[model samples]
Target: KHNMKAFLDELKAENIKKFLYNFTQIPHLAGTEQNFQLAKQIQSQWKEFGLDSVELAHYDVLLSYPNKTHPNYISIINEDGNEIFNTSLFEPPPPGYENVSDIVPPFSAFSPQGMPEGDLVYVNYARTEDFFKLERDMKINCSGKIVIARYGKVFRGNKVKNAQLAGAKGVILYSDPADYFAPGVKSYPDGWNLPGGGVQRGNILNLNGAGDPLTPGYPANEYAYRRGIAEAVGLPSIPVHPIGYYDAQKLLEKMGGSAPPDSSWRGSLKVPYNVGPGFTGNFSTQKVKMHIHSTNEVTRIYNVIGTLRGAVEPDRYVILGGHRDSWVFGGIDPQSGAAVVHEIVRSFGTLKKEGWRPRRTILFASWDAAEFGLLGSTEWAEENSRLLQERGVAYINADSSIEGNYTLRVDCTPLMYSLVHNLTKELKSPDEGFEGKSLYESWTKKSPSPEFSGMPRISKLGSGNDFEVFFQRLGIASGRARYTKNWETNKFSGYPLYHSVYETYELVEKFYDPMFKYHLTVAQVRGGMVFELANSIVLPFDCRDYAVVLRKYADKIYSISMKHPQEMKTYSVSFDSLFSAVKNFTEIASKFSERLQDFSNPIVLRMMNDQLMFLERAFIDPLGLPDRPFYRHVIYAPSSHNKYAGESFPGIYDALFDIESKVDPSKAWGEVKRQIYVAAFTVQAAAETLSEVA
Candidate 1:
């Protein structure tokens, strides 16, 4: 309670605003001079903040970059082969960036260098289903065609991969007005919506494995046996480019074919929204060509990590982290997030100076190259895999700290559900209209679920940010708290200037958080959770809550399986084992809960905490799921279909049970049967972990 009170007292919006400005003054793109300088700044300031130990952890990673001299752009050419239209691959400085000239131009990182030209095709969001419609239902051919897709529904990298898999020669991605800039909403430089020239640049490494591209299951440390670039996993094979919707309309309006079957495929643009393989009318013979003069080079990226050693359990750890780099000026994506983590560290640093020590060590990280993939955090985790699996308590991530000032949105392991839910109840909303209301009050109203009644439902952690490796690969109980617009009605397209040039410190000061109170609120909640885990003699994890959530997921999957009763009969398939396994978990958790009443002895207290900490790891399988070896968590991993929090038992959900079931049915059911065994056994193993006795 001393630490909690001191920590809360130390946090101030004015201080956090300065830190936010410090983090966003320059564009810290991965593998750049500014990124490296920021990493150094973080390490120095962390020590100034009073961390016990501060150091730079480096990984030699192959990072992608656009060719400054050659330049990368897209052009539409007429029959005579003269370029009639082209993208400048740049966004003119938004208001605050008047004197700044070093901004990274628009180019999809990981997209290879080459000039790939072909007929242009507008394929909506370019999700798998979008491409499926292009080929299967619409009778459209993608071979030798350049696909133009809107940015939504999935990761930008996955869009390029989907196009490549569909035999398209190249990919062009853009932010559509229908999503980022609603018709009634005004654009940036005035309101919160995106402007026409604001290109949303990002790393196209979705399918690519996490961490340094050259290393697999190992840290990219010095002389760490790096793989050749030719052997890189998940790098985009074709040239890919991103542009503003203004440029998107330029390309779309010229192309023509039959209109899309559903108007949902169309964005708010006034274009015809046709499924074209080539141009129509005046530009009928024109072809769309894209050139990506990008290069890949090996460079050192740092993870600036600092630790506050525990007075009692020095080996055990509670880590709070966020990325140090951004795609551009990451006012919303990574900088705002990192700034929150910095303030939390500074408060802890303040507490430490006053002789307050946590029961367990707190490690803070400013991961580098996070924009390129989860490179910095992933490499750091891989290097300390065994140590982490043994001592890690909980990991809290802070990226996209405040996408919108609407409500507090959380995605976490069910182990931390109670921790998050309780903390929100303690803090009031920073939004103007919600006077005197706690975050729990406003959040539940905006994002409540029917099952949870008045309570806000916490979503499961998924692969999107720095938490991926900690939660998915090593089984650390991880969570991220963010302020997000209610996706229930707002079209679910993230903050308007997300990952674009327009996301600046000024943007945050005016639009996202005018008073900068949300950043302070977020820091308090995240830091509060870390303190509870780090200081409490008994870990505050709710294993019973996890079991309850697990049961819900199990039954939901069961209901879906029941729809295929005949298929189950034919394949002799069943989720009965999974159902039984969930029962085992529920019983074991209740049994475990009752036994946790005693905390008299230090030895015995440590033993119980260890078991509670290890409970999350029991769901991990070294063999991993059927195809993805890197994704070892059986209970939760990124969904193969869409990288959201996956099915409860992702291994089994894939067989013939999923709505997006893609494999051959006869054999897929058999595969599904195999996954059930894995899921059931994994769940039982987790239950047994709880039932352990010293």
Candidate 2:
């Protein structure tokens, strides 16, 4: 039975390559015929592979796209009403992708359709702070101008959101050499640097809640009532578009204004970094016009689910999933992960044929519409929320399994931290020169654990992937591991061709993982995790690691509190009670670890495992984190601004950190107090779940 994963080690690299190549042969955008076609084939394959049950979960949700008849563009209009300059809004296939004719035109998804013309201004990254500095401190208004912001430091959706909130008419986001590569560097086909015409298309929906635009706190099923634009929180108004740095230089060099006082705003562009209000030089007589004629339609998306039933604890479940859709060919974005998942499922199928059975049921899904704010996974989790919370143990995600060859990266809830490290320790390092070392060995060398020396770091779970709905909404402990680039060697927002049409299988096979070793290793680790969870006597969760990480988060928040002692005194904001709750939780977690011995009784085994599973669910307030009801888990919530990082104790931390900035300072302080109370109550409540009550 343990041979389930042992046999996977021999899974041919050629098989993984074959899957990636075939999946990427056509552009599979979510909600499209190509997307559903792939999902249907996946369903047939699952049934053939011997899954107990296989079905497609369907939903009708809102989706957006640029007009095919008329491409969206940015142009300079002359005084004679003629266009002097224009953007092509296209990128011919990168080297070998010429056969692909359905390449999506570059446009921000969910950006409301409109044509807005006005004076153009340069904003630094378009961060909220940058807007505050420009509109308030610098006394330069973005009220009627169409702003152009360099892409870096924040989510593109957030960039457009902040611009609209700052009163900008429309937004233009472009890659800057300062953030991507040095000027004149070789790009794409020849090198890893970005191509000038390589526009990064992404979703720009201003979702206060994270799911489908038309559905909130419920699934977007055929029978589900839909919410129109009037109530949809995912809508992104104002025209927004992206252009490569090759085109950005033309606009940047002609801007007429004083240079940005902040040197940080300056990228690698040779031209003067101006804070512009209008054009200068030859283009002085013109203003910029942006037209985004996009179409919004009610489209059907699917989530493919297959099950492997258990012999013993049939009701208890473990879930594994990844998104099947992408912006372009998805060679690196998701096909890598998608291909790996298929390989893993194939291994499990072979095992099942050999008469191997796990202890707990396993569910695998190929999620849809993840690129459009995680619609498929969110909708499915919402529909099955009740059962998932009652029986689900953990959710393991394999999203874009290979981003780099440098090292293994894991973003997971604290409950699974120790288990993840053990998995890494069992796998041999893929580094060429570092033979005989475990991945854990090489990993520790790169990023030594901050709290526990000699150990590797395990990150906290946050939004922006398939794992979010399970972890954030249902309070299910979740994780996703990847082979990511070494941040120590270089610093860029993402992989060079991220979201660009240049993200072909060639880039991944040639640059990221040539031998598919990283992809295979990711599969082993991910498959091994699922194997243990499905077959283990008790759930493999460690609350000791959980408590340790929680303590560290508390300490950081405490240090932040000490920095504003006077504000704490005036606002009556205190961290003392929060610290006490953390301390008490740590003691209870220690007791739980000590009690892990002497499992002589079947009734005791069931009791202990259930406690271990539901202990994570205890943090769920049902009402959700403070104001965002969609995010119900109190302990682990997405940072309001950065979707990649967890805002530990977010309900209390975010509100308290920005108390003074609110218009009603005292009222804001009251909100902070309520969040702190919520944190205190939830942590202690969770501790009792782990205590020796029975």
Candidate 3:
């Protein structure tokens, strides 16, 4: 949507080719400590740009666990009539189960301190109430049981902790049959299934709230606020393991009680499944001397700060960031989007030369150490939270860029909907067929899933990547920008390098967006976001649309619980309160919308937007969840039931009972009332603020 003469001529002048070379060739990793050096090199480049000062912040972090050398990946035992044990996909077994066991070695990223054995208990989906039901139904005392939970439906940590709560001594998590884990199932290079022996190893520490167990709710910097390890709530309560289909055979075959697993629960395994305790196995853990590990040293990681000091409102800020770090040569992860940022930077740099600066301050950050848990960005945000919360306004993040053959997906704070809506209109579609159409309009050609599309729908910001610190805790108005189109569905169709060593410069240049023209589009799109937010007259929040998405999420959680009452337990409060508050927010939203026509009310607009921004805090309870204290948002927490994938609304869904049993609905409903009031009040306050500003 740029004047062709300006866009093309500027692209040539930006030295686009040289910029891409620097970003891709200057490889840096968070764990390797190269990140610090890279940051210094990057800062030097910034200094050449004529900035006054480039700050280099240092912080300590623990780079232990998951490092190469930590042994005892995983081991599962059957202690029924005999003892049987198996190891991980790559390691040798710890001994004993050889001929006695029926499956291969099973290992998880993190195993517990003691490898204690116990009676096996089959929990279809290891939800919170599953154990509670086992207690009331079978009269099975879970205190000493070995809990077997499948991978789907919950987080690995939640499964382990719930097993612990149920009196389970250890936890075994195997991929379920329906999820493409069965033999001959193909995925990725082959199809969509896990490789025969491949296992997904990840941390259960809820570190997304803040990385590293030693520091919780604080930046990992030297002088930042810190809490004692004893007081930290982010630690995992029990050891957790992820077993592939091959290793699961031994456990499934040994169950001596109950009939084969229910039809829906059956797998590709040859043996019939059964519930067990009569099913026995051997399992044990030995704590070895783990050396103390230091985090990547204090170094300068670049934020690639580029700005147009606002002429009218220079103090107010609008920030746009795309992380520069990746697991490997992240053409898709951050490179795709990085290309976009560079394009925007070049665009602004060009405009700056022409003597045109924005009306409000704009900052473009190329955050370092974003791959291994948002290190660079999180530390930066934590250190500058006050400034950002007060003067700094909205932030837009674009990482994991890909060929946007279709639509763009966005997620933002309530205060940015309209600003984003108008800004997006300025972005020209990268796809050829969608000439001159708005990003949202192009999205209409596809389906609703990220794979299909209409302008990619904006997802509610939860904890994941840089947005974790931005929207989750600090409540920055933000959204993720990505071009996930038809190709993502095809195996190896795009970004196949992912986190592998194969993600080389040669590969990205060859397979992913050759010549980096798509990269230029990314920059242009995000550039508009930065420019629009920096210069907007209104706070840009549209709670009316914001309320729409909230209602959808609440309806989804409520419907899912009603459909699978048993599996979706104890989630009532998260559901009811979040929505109840949204409903109240609407009443205020109506008033705010009515007053929008008055242009002389920046104070009222800012006040209302601030409240709208703060309203997200209600979802966060300082006490955190029951066992996983690191997670504070009751509605949008990492599933106590599922990992990686969040359970949209956990409180209300967790309270629902299974069809076979009865529960104290009143106890769960009480929390709903409390949350509803708090949420509603927060929303109402935002509307009133807006009305006053208007």
Candidate 4:
């Protein structure tokens, strides 16, 4: 305990702040000179800090960049069909960004280049259900029309994909004031809320899969096979552009048709909400013209990796990663995480100076091209697939580090629940008002649920961050750690200026973490988690918690069975064997944990950790999810119905809920049964392995 305290004490708030400011001094967009320079600088810093080996690994990935000659354009036509406002909705230069010219324009990354003009139709939020409502309730014709969607509830890429699937000519996405604004809150330069013309830019690639678009299921290394753009499964085929609410108001105000069915569809924008083809009770013949031009290329991206080899078992690894590239300044997005990584590495260096070494290897990574997609991490994971599968224990991520106050936001595999909870309980709260309280105490106080008994509920790992490949594709126990709003407990709305230029260091200093205490808190929790993973003799993962989680997901499947009797009757899938397997697994896993305390044999410990490492790997099927081979996890994968959220038992759930699943319910049921069998056998196999170790 004294040694651990000494290590934790080495993580100073001043170091975190210094690193954050230094990393964000220049805009480091991926595939740019600035990004490469920063990567090299990180390598140099890691070497200086005494990391065993520090190097930059390169990948020739297919990434999209804005074509300077052909920027994104949005236009609004008045009732008379005269173009009223036709201009590019570019974000105003952030303070101190006047000379920083590398800011990517307001275009969805990976959205194809084209200029399509048609009648504009409003689709609220553009969720799958929203499109369903449009087709069912509004009786609107989406074919040969341009769809306008508010950015909330789902990834922007899915919105464009849905528009294209519905035969829409193009799509325009905007951040609605309803989702982004705090009541009476002023915009940036005054307050934390987004200003009127603040455009939110992001990648629109269908990231249900992992790795480079051109090299799915493999790394984008020098000799890896590459596919053409058309062959890329998740890449979009339509033009998509993002606009600020200020620009959105110009187009939405003129839109007139039947209002959305419920008041819930309305945004905070002043205009009355309507599902429109054109102005209603006015000029109905006018349409909207959206012209978007961009370019995609096979460019080089870097992943800066720094390793500190273990004294005892260097083969085993605990990997910590955060993306380095950003759409803009990325002060809070990745820089915060990057800075935390640097501080962690520095702290470890301090520990080394005191003659301490980890029992397992630790890899600190700064990934590139994460904004465009999870390019850097995925490709590297693929490049080292066999070794990772054999030795990788866990992958911890920090994407957007600190965006709010007290609460700790987490999305992790169930094996990590107890570990994270215990770690948080040990650390004092950064919030000065909450004196003598730990992070766990403050986090759980707001949500006093009977089920969890005031304990923090770990969210399921969702797509949209660097953890995607590790958790979904490779089935490694992975998660993201950050200080953000936990919607389950708090009423704190959200950060309004995400992905915009306003996400600068000044904003982070002023609005987000004024004292930079949250930054230190993040580093403490994240660094502590990595240390526990590296130093634990028995492997800190709780196998019993994993069994409990599997049972919960099994309960969900049974609940689904009860709700949809007709579907179940047609599909005829059974969870009986799965239940039995989980029961057996629970008993064995409990025994494994209980006996672990008295175990002392080094060979037995090694064998046990090896078994534990393979526990997650058992859940993956190389054949991949139903028709979605890129997402190989049978238990957890991004929903085909929604790209952003995770779907437990995705193979079964997606099969039952996907549109194509309806085409053949029996076939979908067959798929569900197959996946259930796969999962059941995997659990049974894991239990057998545990028994052997025990």
Candidate 5:
């Protein structure tokens, strides 16, 4: 549906212009019916591309609870005794709050209820690592304590989960006023900043576990199947929410009886943040009603798939995907990348018409319901897991691809690193004046640009985005690509209005991509990568580097195990076979990469590519991952310990984490060995593939 002219005119309509008003004027969260409408528009735009077919790939996701229906969060009674306020008492209290005497309307959705109410204990990061330390070193007990943790080190749910694990009754996460929420907050919109007392509530599903809390290892289709409430594991045990800096000031102002936090714990909160059970005495609050409200909206969602079958070995596939759905008028997140994929289709459409065909099929998919837990892509992957595992070569996914001041980062399989490095060298960054170099070369050459460079080669593929279902569940060599680092403009972290009402086409044209030139650039980069993958005689899989990264992870796990002996007692840590596998795989992988480095024949390249394609298969087993039958990858996956957080060596690190946390030792060790074995198998598979190719 490449009907750009009419669609462009429709975008220009007066009523459409007025439609932007509600998003700007009102506050609406993602997942509302309106968000679905926005998804429809993108689908229509794709239809306009004149593709063979453009339709919504429908999936059923229950909207838990509407914000409007949630009761008044808190009612604060003034101890000031001045009572008598009548004119100022009109607005309803914050959604998740209740019983607020001081009258700070809008309670944090994440604030835990039923606190012991003492001095506030400010843990600098409140990470699992830090929490383990406080309990071990200081012999501190956090039960019934209110924890004030700065945002960092992990996701907001993780912070809450960690605090709860430490027996802390309540958790409050605040942003540093100096860094993020300050009035002059480094210039975006004065209001766009992460203000104090804002809430950042998110799902706490253990990703390594089953998705769809209701049904594990089952489809979440409304009519296909369903799970009872007793079987659900997706919901969080504790309350969690994000708050703005404006509210954080009040908490900091109220703090008194506690030692000043460590230097590393200091934040932009003006005053020295402390680690105390504040002098506020006892505290008590209860959740009004925490029941699941059925939101079974069976919205039709779809993947817009276009394939150019390979001219040579049609069995192999190189897939490129970017989600089409956006929470609001998502000009940045998926839309930016989705538009790029569309342009790729346009480019490839031209190429195919000109008879320039590749050796393998290339699948470009614009997934649906991506915002609601990778629903569209995951369901697709889960349904087609077997075929993908057997035939899928690799998936290069681009979701949120807005280039700011940051250098580009690729979360890739180490087996494919060198090849990607070589490929990226042929590409150029879209923005000029940042020394004008390809993002890959800039990072590899260790560009001394002020932006973040040479941090780590490539972060391992973890969960989050569409890559999760593919890499984690199916053991496919999947990777997500993002352009980051430019801090000058409002685009530094990309998508200033991420998941908010600010995501509109108008905002994008005015502020984000003004020229729309990058849209073409993103398409070309991603398209070119897919093109290279499809045509290459030998797929790129760098096993040696992968082994190196795993070794690093294994070493970290071993050290943490030793440092926290009691913690390590929780899970089984088999350092012997795991470490041996890492050592053995690294040596062989190095040889494999060296073999390819010296080659130059087209046949050799094709053979090499075939070998590389099997790397992901080494991780899959018929039985699947330990407790979570869904996730299959041993080495790379979104951590159950850290949702949307990727661990280079998930098997080892996850086991060690389980050990520290007191999960089943036998099960943990079994998984560790499984991952290491699978990782070794993947390398071996690559080696065998290489031997034949060589």
Candidate 6:
């Protein structure tokens, strides 16, 4: 309680705002001079704050960048065989931000280099189903054609991969105004929506796994094991480019064939949405051509780390991290989150000066190159795999700290549900008129779920940010917090300028958080969670909660299997073994919970904590998932079909039972049963570990 009070008292709102403003002054893209300077600044600041040890952890990894001199080229030729419209691959600066002379081109990172071009085909959103429609409904042949897709639905990299799989020669991705600007919303420089030609640039590296593309399961440390670039599943084979709606409209207006099947396929652009292998009327003979040239190189990136060793259990750790690199200024995506980490470290510094020591060491990291497929975090985790597996308790990530003024949105493993839920009940709301109410009260009043009654729901973790490697790969319990918009709406909308140059400090100060209170709120909640995990003697994790959540997932999968019994004729998903394992877990967990009151010796306390720390490790299989050996978690992982969504029992539910695969049904079912049995045995092993502590 003394440590908590001291830490909370030292957290200043002004300091958070100041840190944020300082971060937005320059661009810190990974593998750049600014990024290195920022990393050094963080280390220097931590040393000045009296941290125990402040250092920069370096990793020599593969990263991609554009050749600004040769830049990317996109051109649309007319029926007369002449170029009509071409993009300069340069975007004008938004208001309040100076000229971005060194801005990265609108190119998807890790895309192959080529001038391969052909007839353009508009395949709305370019998801797997969209490709199916292009083949079945439109009768359009994608071979030797350039496929154009709208971003959002899934990762941009997957879109390019899907197009390549569909026999397209190249890929062109764009952000439709329907998603970014909506209809009634005003554009940026006026309101929060994107401007006509504003491009959303991002990495297209396949995120099915994490870390350097050339170094899959191993760290990209100097002299570490390396594989050929072509062998990496994360890298793309087809050339891909991202364009703004202005250029997208140019290609769509000239194209013609059959109109979109339904309104769902239509975007807010003025042109009639059509499926075309080439343009209609006069331009029918012409096709879309693009000249995209890029290069990939192996470069050095750094992760700035500062640690405060525990007075009692020095080996045990509670880690908190946020990325420092961004595509542009990254005021919202990485900088806001970085600012919160700075404030948290400063608060910890104040507590350290006051002679307060945590029970478990607290490690704060400013990750580098996370924007490029979470490279920095993933490589660091791989290098320390054994150490983290033994001592890692929790990894708390803060990316895009405040995206909206709405309720708090959390994505975490179920083992961390109680810790998050209980903490919200203690902190007051940041809203001015609702200052007296707790976050739990404010969140429930607006976003109550019928299933949970009046309680706030904690969403499950999925890959997108820095938490993936820790939770999915190494079995560390991880979570992230952000002030997300659209809490009550089933129809999700994009954050107008996500990952674009327009997401500057002006947007945050003018439109998102005028008073900057939400930023403070994020720091408070994240700092509190880190403190509880670092200081707790018994380690405040509930193994029983994991059993409860796992049962729900297993049953949900079983229900889906029942609906398509014919398709699943080879295998039946009976939850018998899973439920039996849950029963054992519940009994042992209850005993451990009851036995906590009897512990008096520090050595015995640490032994119990060590058992609790490695309980999640049982979910990881050394043999790894069926095809993806890097992702070993049996319980949760990024959905194979959708990277943004999480898949429960990913190996069995998503991979083994996939209907689209050409593999023999019987053989696939064998994998299904194998994973199911493995998962069940893993749960029983966790129960045995709990029984030992009991």
lDDT of 4 by residue, 286-388 (tens): 6687777788898899999999999899998899999999887888888988888998899898788667789999999999999888899989998898888
lDDT of model 4, residue 587:
97
Alpha carbon deviation, residue 221, candidate 5 (Å): 3.0
User: For model 3, how does the per-residue alpha-carbon lDDT over 1-694 read when each residue is reduced to its tens digit?
Assistant: 3332253335531344456556655345544455566556656665554333455555565432332344343333322333235545342211232232212122332343444555566776676656655566556565766677765544455666667767666666665444433246333333333443444433344464665445655667766555554554445445556655666676666665555334644555676656665453333221111111111223334455555577777777777777776554443556666656666655665666566666677776778666545666777776677877667667788676553334565556545666655655655566668777765566545435343334444555545567666665565567665655454223122222234323434444554456565555555556656666665565555767766656666677567545645433554433455566667667766666675644356676666555555545434555655544545555565444444345555544444424335465555456544544544444445435434543
What's model 6's TM-score?
A: 0.96
Put down candidate 2 lDDT per residue, 399-419, tens digits, no spaces.
Answer: 798766778888888888878
Runs in model 2 with CA error above 4 Å?
4-7, 182-185, 488-492
Model 5 earns a TM-score of 0.75
- lDDT value, residue 585 of candidate 4: 91
lDDT tens digits, residues 1-694, model 1?
Answer: 5657678878888887998888888888887788888888889999999999999999888888888889999998878989999987688888757788679898888888888878888888887778778888888988888888888777677678788888888999889887788557678877778998988888887542457788888999898998787887778778889999888889998777778779888788888888887877777888888888889888889889899999999999999998888888888878888888888888888888888888899999999888888899989998999999999998999786888777788888988888878878888777667889988888888888657788896787767688888888888999888777755534234678888888888889987787888888888888889999998879989899988888888887777777888878888887888889999999999888888873358777778888899998998999887767788899888876556435567777766444335556787777878888888899998999887574
Tell me how far the alpha carbon of residue 197 in candidate 5 is from the true structure, in angstroms, after superposition: 7.9
Cα displacement (angstroms), candidate 3, residue 23, comes to 5.5
List residue ranges in candidate 6 displaced over 4 A. Answer: 79-81, 96-100, 136-139, 487-494, 567-573, 597-599, 655-663
lDDT of 5 at 499: 46
Q: Comparing 1 and 6 by lDDT, which wins?
A: 1
Best model number under lDDT:
1
Error of 2 at 128 (Å): 2.3
Q: Rate residue 326 of model 5 by lDDT.
A: 54
Clashing pairs for model 4 are none
